[PDB]
Symmetry: C4
Subunit: 104 residues, 4 copies
């Protein structure tokens, strides 16, 4: 039915601040992909993470169900591997069905 967005989005910036070994502190605001799947089929999302000096890593899989939103924190990604902090990266977000992606 309703089809809004597209199957591939790219975010050229990405950086998780080097906060030390506890939780990401209250002070610094993170980076979060906000995804809307306004369609009637579940979105199987695959994120690839790009770096300045090494091969990309992924896919990081996750599902955004039919007619739902999901916020994805880059800091929460861990399969296949966590993203190193204090490191510049970029991502490609791919989906089987159209989705809307925003980065705040």
């Amino acid at each position: 039915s309703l089809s809004i967005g597209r199957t591939c989005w790219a975010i050229a910036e990405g950086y998780i601040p080097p906060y030390g070994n506890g939780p990401e502190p209250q002070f610094i605001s993170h980076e979060t992909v906000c995804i809307l799947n306004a369609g009637d089929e579940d979105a199987h999302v695959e994120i690839t993470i790009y770096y300045s000096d090494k091969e990309p890593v992924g896919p990081y899989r996750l599902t955004v169900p039919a007619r739902r939103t999901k916020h994805v924190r880059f800091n929460d990604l861990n399969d296949p591997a966590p993203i190193p902090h204090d490191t510049d990266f970029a991502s490609v977000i791919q989906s089987n069905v159209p989705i809307v992606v925003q980065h705040t």
Copy 2:
């Protein structure tokens, strides 16, 4: 003779703390706008209906939406905004 924008827009982030869609209708026909609000864990709600007259702008505060239901505060949502005629929608 001015047709600018499109009939469907989606804003992937929304949150009202425990904000505003600005809409321009630069066209010669009134826009009958419908907003649907999406959530992480429940079915979407709407249509919230409003009119942006010909050759006018309107700022819509999500907090002011109440028919069919108010939007809960401290809740992440997203919206799809649909119109009969092309409109330009922006969010800060």
Copy 3:
């Protein structure tokens, strides 16, 4: 002879407290720009005219616009920016 951008841009927010369009013309012909200002409760006002020369930028402050009339402060508005030649516009 680069052609980048487009001839019509719309900015749905505008508010001068009780601000800046940045324009690039990367082309080889001066851009004659016209701005129209839209309101929630009155007919639009314009064209406000200005020129962005070939291969130059220009920052336009909504506050500085005055012909045909200044834009009231503490008032929500929107603008349409139209050009004879493609330009890039950011707010």
Copy 4:
């Protein structure tokens, strides 16, 4: 394989005045299989454009370019409004912070 982005991006604003940083930065992603030979042109209100500033973003890599770090053909004057056009032989994705 993956082709995402485009060969020409324009950024209409630019200005060079414990842990965060605010230099004007172009973040570029080349998600494609061929290195991007990028050319930056810097545009001014009152003088001719300057460039190309040349740099390479390798295949399947990202690069952060600080406007402050640009110097060939010339450094960009500080406390000066500018704009930039970023051109590439292959599609790239460009974002600025």
